Structure 1
Amino acid sequence: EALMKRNFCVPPGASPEVPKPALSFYVLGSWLGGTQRKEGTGWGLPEPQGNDDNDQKVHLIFFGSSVRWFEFLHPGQVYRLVAPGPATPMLFEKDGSSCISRRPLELAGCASCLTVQDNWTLELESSQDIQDVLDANKSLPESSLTDLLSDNFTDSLVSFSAEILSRTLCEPRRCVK
């Protein structure tokens, strides 16, 4: 999702104060394995992923000083985060309701959220190790010409890849064409 001004929601069990509008965003992604522990230079064998009926989808709210990581996130790339310190159980599954769990108005009711912590950092994995997953790094998804140009008016989600011809700004409403 893009970066803009966002409003959080009421924290669970905290004071009922309106969250301030703060610049932030969030991402959606799918896991590849269970809890993993560091071992020497690398990391130990991860725990098996729970065979749960819940979809292996997570939402990560980025805010505070973590906004600086926005420019290093792109679809189809393998990302592994790290939580410094001891491997405390129940840390990569869902937000802790007791701790700071503030979500935007469009994500408060989601059943799959994981707010990042400042001490956490993110690194990019190697190509050879996870080459199997990287095989799906084809062209980014895009709707057909018929779907984009059919009349209807159902649905407002489209995607393509074009080449800019001309640019012009509009002023009296602020608009750039």
Structure 2
Amino acid sequence: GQSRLFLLCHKEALMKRNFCVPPGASPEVPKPALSFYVLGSWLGGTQRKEGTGWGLPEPQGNDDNDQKVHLIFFGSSVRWFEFLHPG
């Protein structure tokens, strides 16, 4: 198994959105779909599964880019909406 920790900062609303054309996909306009995304900051490197528990985190990437990530939720992952809160 693989894991990574992140701290939630702000959560957008849940509404119908029109996705972008995927890179290299067919030039067909996507149908509107229910989706939302959150903005969160990573707290460390990737952690590898170690039996029941998890191993020590890998060293954080020496990247000058800000430790910020966008997590786009859609499809069948929309069920996590009510379990996410800032802080």
* Same topology, TM > 0.5: yes
Q: Could you state the TM-score of these two structures normalised by the residue count of structure 1?
A: 0.41
Give 1:13 shift. Answer: 0.8
Give 1:30 shift. Answer: 0.2
The DSSP-based 3-state class of the residue aligned with 2:62 is coil
Structure 2 gaps, min length 5: 1-11
Q: Could you state the TM-score of these two structures normalised by the residue count of structure 2?
A: 0.82
| Higher RCO (CA 8 Å, separation ≥ 6 residues) | 2
Give 1:19 shift. Answer: 1.2
Q: Which residue of 2 aligns with 1:36?
A: 47
The DSSP-based 3-state class of the residue aligned with 2:47 is coil
CA deviations on 1:89-134 (whole Å, 9 max, x unpaired) are xxxxxxxxxxxxxxxxxxxxxxxxxxxxxxxxxxxxxxxxxxxxxx
Structure 1 gaps, min length 5: 75-177
Higher strand fraction: Structure 1 or Structure 2?
2
Alignment length (residue pairs):
74
Give 1:67 shift. Answer: 0.3
Give 1:23 shift. Answer: 0.9
CA deviations on 1:58-77 (whole Å, 9 max, x unpaired) are 00010001100100000xxx
1:46 aligned to which of 43, 50, 57: 57
For the aligned residue pairs, the C-alpha RMSD in angstroms reads 0.7
Identity across the alignment (%): 100
